[PDB]
Every structure is written in structure tokens, then in C-alpha cells.
Amino acid sequence: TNTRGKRRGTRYMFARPFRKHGPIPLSTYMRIYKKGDIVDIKGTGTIQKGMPHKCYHGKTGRVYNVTQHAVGIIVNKQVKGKILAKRINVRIEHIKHSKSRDSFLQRVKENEKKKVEAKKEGTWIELKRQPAAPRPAHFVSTKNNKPQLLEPIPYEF
Amino acid sequence: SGDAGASATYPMQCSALRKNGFVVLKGRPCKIVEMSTSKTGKHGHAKVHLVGIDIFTNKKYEDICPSTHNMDVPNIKRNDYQLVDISEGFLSLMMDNGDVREDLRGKEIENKFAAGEEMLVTVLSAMGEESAVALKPM
Amino acid sequence: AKSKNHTTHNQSRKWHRNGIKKPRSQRYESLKGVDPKFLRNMRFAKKHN
Amino acid sequence: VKVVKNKSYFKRYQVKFRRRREGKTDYFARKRLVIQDKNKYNTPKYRMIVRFSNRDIVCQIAYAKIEGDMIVCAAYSHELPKYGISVGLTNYAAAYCTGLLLARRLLNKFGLDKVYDGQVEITGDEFNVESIDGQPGAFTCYLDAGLARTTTGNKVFGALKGAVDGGLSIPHSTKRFPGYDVESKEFNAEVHRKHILGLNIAEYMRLLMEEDEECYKKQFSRFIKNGVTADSMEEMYKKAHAAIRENPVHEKKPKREVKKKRWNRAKLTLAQRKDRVAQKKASFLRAQ
Amino acid sequence: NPMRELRIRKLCLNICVGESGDRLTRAAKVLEQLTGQTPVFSKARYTVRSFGIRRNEKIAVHCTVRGAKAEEILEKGLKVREYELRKNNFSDTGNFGFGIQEHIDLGIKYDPSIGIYGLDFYVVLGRPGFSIADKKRKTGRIGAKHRIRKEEAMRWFQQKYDGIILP
Amino acid sequence: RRPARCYRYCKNKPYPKSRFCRGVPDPKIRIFDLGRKKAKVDEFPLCAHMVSDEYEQLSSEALEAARICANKYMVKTCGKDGFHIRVRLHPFHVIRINKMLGMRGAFGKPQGTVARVHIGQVIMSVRTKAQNKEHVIEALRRAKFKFPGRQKIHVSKKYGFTKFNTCDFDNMLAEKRLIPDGCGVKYIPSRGPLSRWKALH
RNA sequence: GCUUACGGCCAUACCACCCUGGAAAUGCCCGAUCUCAUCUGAACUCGGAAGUAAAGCAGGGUCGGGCCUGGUUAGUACUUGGAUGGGAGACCGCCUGGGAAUACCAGGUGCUGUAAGCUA
RNA sequence: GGCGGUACACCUGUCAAACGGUAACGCAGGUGUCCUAAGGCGAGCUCAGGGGGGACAGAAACCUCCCGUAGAGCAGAAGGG
RNA sequence: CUCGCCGAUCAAGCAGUUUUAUCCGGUAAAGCCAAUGACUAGAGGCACCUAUUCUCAAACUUUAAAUGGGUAAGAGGCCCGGCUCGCUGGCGCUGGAGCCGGGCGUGGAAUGCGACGCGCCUAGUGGGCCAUUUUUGGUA
Ligand SMILES: [Mg+2]
Ligand SMILES: [Mg+2]
Ligand SMILES: [Mg+2]
Ligand SMILES: [Mg+2]
Ligand SMILES: [Mg+2]
Ligand SMILES: [Mg+2]
Ligand SMILES: [Mg+2]
Ligand SMILES: [Mg+2]
Ligand SMILES: [Mg+2]
Ligand SMILES: [Mg+2]
Ligand SMILES: [Mg+2]
Ligand SMILES: [Mg+2]
Ligand SMILES: [Mg+2]
């Protein structure tokens, strides 16, 4: 049976990248985390204080509490067959802003301007994503690219 | 005040006891001279027979205990001191601090200091009290 | 008389039997665990408006 | 002897930060100085930057940002000739003025020059400005010594005293001001007033002029041609402090248009680079 | 050209006494009458029974002189060497050094109270501008065309002190 | 010892002799290069391999036996200074042996080293003159009977023990792109300092 | 374009050697009375301005090492899913999708934010 | 089964199949302590090793210059930093 | 039992599935001429030293898949005005959070489904065995 230590199996995840050791760059310390934004979790072996558990490294939750040096996150952790919302305290050196919702916010701001532009012009531009449709019918010209004959090559050892 | 400690000993299994070791028998450490174990039946258990010589004066002790039993093992530590004048009734020694201590008691040493050839004694501490046995020159 | 020690064979079939339900995210989340200095002032911003 | 700088050395080599390789920034002390608490939400954490060159003193006020910290106000030591101090632009007295010039100029652009005027008179005692109710709060920043060893009497604390006397609310103590007897653990403010007004400079001009005039001309050469004597030290800095409190605002120089004439040679292009080694090969085969 | 004068920075001297005790304490008095300043006790690093020393045991004394005192003592130590040194006494990086077996010829009378001691003179040669490697802020490197060489340090010894390099 | 039928297939992860595995006996094969090993590249142009066709593991005793079998045939047909054999398989996988017999604590002690081979990996390589082709193929053929599985005796197109073809090796010598150094060559690209280019000319 | 202060990214910025540059600025440099400081005014601290480019610094040079980027290696290695596929076996081929890495080759070598000053 | 062992309470690397989890009397190991500092903080400093040197002094004492991405050290096992 | 039942007249929400977007990892492979450790052979420069070479790692790795894990795809949104605070503070908005009012459906990926919605009581079971692939001890 394995040991129940808090840092068993974290030999590589809490390590630092090659030629990226040393002090933490001071941009991660001057990022503002409000209450209700989506943040990622990625532990760092440099700051041994307030580091998340290995069951949260790579997960993603929302912020519910902000303190002097850390941030309270609500992470959903599946234990056996149930998903539970965990309230964890992780310092700001192990987290970063999640760009998963920035593609949604940029898409909303572009939608709020497309309907007001179609309303004052009288068009019917559709505001809805669609999967990759089958390719339309197109002509393939062979004016300067004649089909080159391919054939299997003999076996050589 | 830092008089002394509280542990003063440690218990351990009886089968882990080795020959030429030390163990507590009848409330005093003894020098185990020989150990022999034997079975008891068909699916017999390891019956351990112990016999040890008391390190202080005399009165060899013995005891029977199973191998999976626990028995107290004392802390045997010996410290070295430098001899002083033993012309009084008690033997005098000095520690690293440089102060003298006179609590001990032999005949071959109490008069040796008056004729030269200084030596250093090794006082052995145990459960009950302290005593000096060995002597080596330099 | 040895037996089988550990297994997670039929567990995944039992989990998805009644489904793996995500935690119910309710509107107006709780306020337990928030900074006591922040909550003490927020209760003063509600008894004065 | 084995080579230490081989391919395996540079492949495993990780360089320090650029400001660390140049020896200008201490990132261990910068983190504990410019980083604001997370429960402040973009509250600017100001700091007073004091730097010393061989001929100039730089005093700046900045607050950290991700794309680089912004300088709110900057006062240099070469602006003192505008106020009267034309000599000794790097001594302790000139440090008290550029700190005072930074304090009064900052309070001017923030509309805080009427309130929090500080100590108009120089007494040397420990002075900390008080925030008066009803009025806007005092400006609270911090000192940034950098790589300068903070010993008793360092000129870094001269600009610190000049800023707290201008109106800035900087937390500090009189342990590192010149005049603190560490034996008795008491701060003699009268000694500090001498260093602020350059009275310790005057005693040097008198100890030399009354012992050997030859060395006085070498040590204070530009003090003789500018017409400043050992008896015109205390009054010169006093009237300089008065001019600083009157017009601390600094107007920028007119932007002089330049055609951008380059004085450095450009990098060799790929054509000039390959053609050069083509000529060396051809010239090498002719010689053999 | 004037900013390349091959001047002397410091003159290092030390007496490596066998062990601590009254013998080492009296050796420090020799450096007080010659240099004019209190030396420092250099304790040992590792214990070795072959030499009879232990760790953290004060073994040797040493002192450093910078200004004209460094030029005086260095000149007073070369008259014992007859103003001549060997060829291999120069290091491949400028500075060189020598040694004497008796300090009595160094302008100090032999006294029967304190025993006789022999120091070890080591002069660290320099050049105006080397302080850029010692200062904390804006610390930099010297350079190839500015650091001293062995051929440059030997000719300086032959011109200032009229020394003779024995091959 | 235990027959090779028990340690033929690569069943376990590689178990090399290291800090954790102590007490491994010395391998049976200790010499890997024979013949006139200190010969230049232009002396032995031909090259022939013994390519493996099975993903298995070859014992250290088999590598020792097949080396001597191929060596004794080359010294009688091509002389002791007319070839160069280079065994290209080092025994690094330590096979284990259980205690001499239940299975309480069945993890066994080391028994010996065995070289793991892949499909297409060269087992042995012999370089010689261009007229000794019929002798090397026969010498490497007799060594297959000391190995389990299936092997192929392929005459390589490379120039000796180098990694450059024979049709390009002579051209790269005139262009000073390859310089001989012992039994191999040095690939000199056109992207170094110009000082070493002038040394070649 | 340049010289400084504070930086962000943290080698396209580093490393070795060579060459050139001082308008402002910077650096070296000149002193130990005061503050402070060590064995030593070397460092640290402080006072100063005779010299102006030796070094720092900056800009160039190298069929430079490194680093960065791309090509190639290769649709190769490996892999999801499938078969009453082959084979004594080891293992291999195919169907349906994803798809690397070194070597080798080529190009590039700091960008940039705030504030102040100078047009070498 | 007994004897042995503790896989009975814990820790590191691996096994473990690139989230987490995952067994065997699987593998290599460690623990029942130590520390008024080896706790807290501030300041200064740069280590392991190698080269050239320097009375006695040598392969090992000490002084000093140069290179030195950490290859040292951080009480202990190992990993991370 | 609370609803939806009337289907996107409605808000919806959900998913052992894909798509779009954004993160996590250090296994296969690869590498060792890059570090740690192991390892064969010559060559050059005066045993080492430099540039090469053969062969490996489960408790090594610069690099690095496939499969896979988390999150985001709207009215609980977006935007605007006012107010409150003892918290925050150069800066009655300086941050922040709370409160109140107003404006704005082209429900703003595919497919499927009534919500496996909210509770209560609860028996049996807690010796499993087999196969494809992955894999440990073992000659098997
Ligand atoms: Mg374990
Ligand atoms: Mg069971
Ligand atoms: Mg069981
Ligand atoms: Mg079941
Ligand atoms: Mg190949
Ligand atoms: Mg010049
Ligand atoms: Mg290059
Ligand atoms: Mg590439
Ligand atoms: Mg144990
Ligand atoms: Mg997995
Ligand atoms: Mg809704
Ligand atoms: Mg049970
Ligand atoms: Mg039950």
C-alpha cells in the first residue's frame, strides 16, 4: 500500500521548467484576483507556503474570497462517484487567470454590437456558432499543376 | 532546574536481545553472557532462556520469557574523567567545565596518584547509580 | 486462507448507475470562510442604506 | 586542465534577470516593497526612489505595474542651481533639498500644497506629518534605498528627511539619521541640523583654510570661483529651501527637433557577411 | 595611457604559526610593529593530525596594507632578497610574491623576549579601474586589454625597483 | 546454469546494474572489438552486419560464443590483420534467479546480464577488404547458430563502420568534409570558425 | 538616435576575443575633517572635481560556442478504436483517427513601459 | 500452520500504464529522534571543485589572484526548492 | 412529493458523446555529441586533455505524443444611474463589496432527453471468477 503523504508523486509537477528556476518573476504578484473570476491552479515548488494539493494541480475553479497573500477558490473535486465543491486557500504564486471565459466575453461583446448594427441597418446576420460545415463545391484548375503520377517504391533493406 | 531526564530506559522485544548485550533483570542491568532459545511442542513457540551477570557487583540473574515478549533494556553509557588526589575518603574527578567532583567508592589507583603515572578513569552510568571499571593510559 | 486485497473493478459501473451529479450551484452562494474584516464592514453597509 | 565553459556548460546555463546581471535591482527586497496586498484591488503602492551618482542625485516616486512602474514625480539634483545651490550637488545638504523639491512638487500636482506644509523651519527633531480630518489624507510612500548600505548618516536618509519635512508621510525612525549615538541610544537632533544645512561642510573649509591653503584650493576649487565661502553655507541652504517651497513645479524643456543623424555603424547585412568570408577564402587560396 | 599605471593595490603578509597559544599571540606583535595595525587571527578549516591542528583553531595571523605603507614594507622586504627574484615567482595573472626566513632584517631589533618569526610577503599588483569588480552596485568585469599579465608585471619590477629576474 | 529458453523473451522492464541492483556477476563477454582495430577507414571499405529479426534478449554467454566463432573463421581465411569485428550489443539487462527450491518473498537474486535486441538492430559488424565478402558472410553465418531466433547477414552500403554511403564517401573526402581519425571519420560542416577551414587547406 | 533612474518579459539579452565612441550624462578618478567603516578609506560611508576614455558602459566584428525560430528528419517512431488478420511463438501486416524527438540544414540575435536630459 | 519477518501506525523514489486513485511477504530506503537555535528577523558575504602563486610548507595547514549555474550546503531517508 | 406536462405558446436544465476556446501532465517514443549514472573503440594535442565513436536506464533527462483530466459556451447575462460602509485611502466613488432603479432576446455550438428534480425508510452484499489490451513477482 502507498503512503498517504501530501507530496507523494509530486516529483515532476511541483518542479520548475528547465532553465526557469530562481526567483518568481514579479508579474505574478501584481495580478488582481477579484471575487468571482475563473482562475487556474498550478503548484510551484519555490513557494512552499499555501501550495495546493496534488489533486488540484491542473484543475480550475472560481474565486470566493481574497486575502492579503492568497485567494480562496471553489474547485470541484470528484472523490469516488460524487463531485464536491472544495473551498481551498492557495497563494497567488500557484494560480493564474483562466482564459477559458475570455473567448466567451470577447464573443459576447462582438454579439452586442452585431445586433445593434443590424437593427439600425435592417439585416439578418445570425449570431450563433456553427460546426465546420462540409466543404462547398469548387473547381480545381490544372493549368500549371498537372497531376503527378505517384506509385509505391520498391522495398530496400 | 535541569536535574535529569524522564526516559532513563527503553523497552524492546526479547528476541531482539543479542549475546554480550545488556538487559534489565530484577531491577538492575546485567551483562547477557549467553542466550539460547528452544521450542515447546509440535507447533511450539520460541521459548527464550536468558542468563546475565550483573555488571555492578555480583548475584547473576536469569529469566524465562517468550520471544515475542517485551523486556526493558537500560541505557548503558560510560564517560571519561581525569584523576585527582584520592587521599580523602572519596575519589575525585573533573569534568569538562574544569570543576571537581568527589563521589566514588580501587586500592591500586588511590595510591598510584601519589607516585605518578597519571591515568583517566571511565565511570559507567546505569539505572541505579554510577561506577568506574575500566582504565586505559595515554 | 489469503483473499483479494484491493479492487476498483465494478466501482465505475456503480458510480454511473445513479449518475455522477455535479454539485448544485445555487444563486446567492454562502458567505462562510470570507475575511472577517471584510464581512464586518459589509454588515455595516447593510444596516445604513 | 579540464575546460569549464564547454557546450554542456552553456546548454545548462540559466542567466539571471537583466537588472540583476547589471547589478541595479535587488529582487529579494523589491518583492517586499512594490507588491500590494491582494485585497486592495489596484490600490497604488507608492515608494520614494533615491539614487546617487558621482555627480547627481535622483529622487523619484513610483508605483509598480505589470508593464513597468510609472514615475509620478521626479526631482534631480542638477535643478538646485535654479534655486541657488550651484556647488556641492551631491552632499548631504543637497540630498535634503532634492527630497524637499520632490515633496513640494508632488504635493503641487496633487493639489496638496496648501495642506501638509511640513516643517518650514529645520529643527532636526523627529517630525511626522499628521492627517487632518475633513481634508484629503496625506501622501504615504516608502523609502527605496536599493543597493546602498543603510548605515547611520547615509544620504539616502537625507532625502527621506527632506520629504517628511515637505509634507510626505513616510514611516521611518531617527536611528539612521546623522546624530544618533548608538552607545546611549539617543538621537541628538542638533547634530542632524548641521548636516542638513551643511554646517559640517563649513567646518571642513575652515579646518583646511586655517591649516594649509594649498589643499583648500584643490578640495574646494569650484567653491572659490562660484563665490561661496565657509560663512555662506547655512544661509545659502536656508534661502534655497525657501525658493523650493515657492515654485517647485518644473517645466519641461522645449522639444528640439533633430533629423536623427546616426553616429554608429549599422550591422552587416547577410550579403555583406557572406561576401566577406567569400573574399577571405579566395585570398587564402591565392597565398598558397 | 596615464590611466594604465601599473601601481600596487595591497601587500599581503602572514605568519603561518604551527598552532595556537602564546607562540601565535607573540607573532601578532610582529605585525603590529611593522604594519602599524592590529592583525586578525585566521583559524583552521579542517583538522589534520599529521600537522597537530584542529578545526576552529587559531593557526595563522595575516594583515593587509594598502597605501604608502604597502610600498614601504614591500621595499623593506626586497632588500633582504637583494632586489632580485626568481622567474617562476610571478603568477600567470599579474601579482607575485616571495618570503623571508627572519623578520629581523625588516627594520626591527631582535629582542630576547619574543621569539623570531618569518612572514610571507605577497604583493597584489593593480591598475586604476580595478575597483569596478569590488563595488557592490553596478559590479562588472575588468576586461582582456586591462588586466595585468606576467610579462607586464615582471617589467614593472625591473623598472621601478631595478629588479633582476633570475631564470 | 538455467537454459536460455527461460530468459529469451523481454518480459520485464530493463533491470540494469546500478545503485539499487547490487551483486551482479560479471558478464561473460568483456572484449567487443577484435582484429586490426587500429585501421584507417580506407583500409576496410566493406561492411557486413548480423541484423536481428526478432524482439528478444540475447544472453551474455551467446554474445561471447558467437564472437569467438566468427573470429576463429576470419583469422584462418583473412589473416589476423585483415578484419575488424565490433560486437554492437552490450549485456545490460540483469536477469534474476529465484531461490533454489513456497514463494514467500519470491523476488530473486541476480543471475547474469542479458542484452536486449530489437527487430532490425545490428548484433555484430565486420569490416574488411573488398575481396573478403565471401569470407565474412560465411563467418557471420556460423555465428548465428550460437544465437536463439532468426538473424540476417546483410552487407551494408555504408563505408565501413562509418554512417556515410560508399558512393558519397569518396566525394566527401575530396571536398574536405570528412577527415579520417582512427577507425572513423569526422563530419566537418561549413558552419564553424574560418580558422579550422584554413587548417584543412 | 544617444545618455541616465525605475522597471516588465527574463540568453534573439549569455560567453570568449577584436575594433570604435564621450555633446550631455555615466564611469573611472582626487581626498579622510565630518557621518560611517573595516586587519587595511580596497570595500562601505562621507567630502570633492585636476584629468577624459585604459576598463565599466554603448555600438560593431566572428563561414564564433550557446540560445531562439523555421525547414527537415517523417506522416517515420509511437498511439485511440476493430477483425473468426498472419504466425508454433516472439511478434508483424492491415482497417479507422491522432501524430512526435535527436542528428542535419537555414535565418535571427534583445524587444519594450514610465520619468528626466542631451543632438556626436 | 510454525519459525523468521511487520508488508500492524507513518515517510521518500519507483511500480502506476503523462490528472487523482490503484495491489502482492513488489523494489531501494527511512522513522518513534534532533534544535534556545538548527526558531524569528535584519545586514553583509558566496559555495563544491580546478589553475597560477607565495619562508618553514610536503599530495593534505595558511595568505592571495583567476575561472567557477551551484556541480556545495540546507540536523536525518529520498525527492522537490 | 415539488414541478414540467402543451415541446424552442416557455424559462429551461441535464449528458459515461462530440465541436469551439483555454489550461494541466512527463507515459510511449526520443536523447545521452545535453546534465546524473553505466559503457566499447581508436584518433589528436605535452596517465590526464580536446574533438569524435559503440551500447543502455525502472527508482536519469533537454525535448515530447496518442488516449486522457479540469474549466468556459448568457437574462444568475450584458450595460447604465443612484445610494450605503466603522473596510480601503493623495484623490464622497481612491479602491472594493453590498443595496436600489432602469435599458437590452436573433436564449446567442452539434445531438439527445420530461427534470435520472427534492426527501424519507431500506433489504441483500462486503469469499468473486474470466477475457482483449496495459502490467508486477515467478523458469512456467
Ligand atoms: Mg512507497
Ligand atoms: Mg475480500
Ligand atoms: Mg485480504
Ligand atoms: Mg461485483
Ligand atoms: Mg538511422
Ligand atoms: Mg581612444
Ligand atoms: Mg553561431
Ligand atoms: Mg528545431
Ligand atoms: Mg521496518
Ligand atoms: Mg493514467
Ligand atoms: Mg435562467
Ligand atoms: Mg471485511
Ligand atoms: Mg452491511
XYZ file of C-alpha atoms (C1' of nucleotides) and ligand atoms in Angstrom, chain G residues 69-71 102 104, ligand 8:
6
model
C 12.891 30.329 -34.792
C 11.950 27.592 -39.163
C 12.924 23.520 -42.557
C 17.756 13.942 -31.982
C 21.387 17.551 -40.278
Mg 14.350 22.713 -34.020
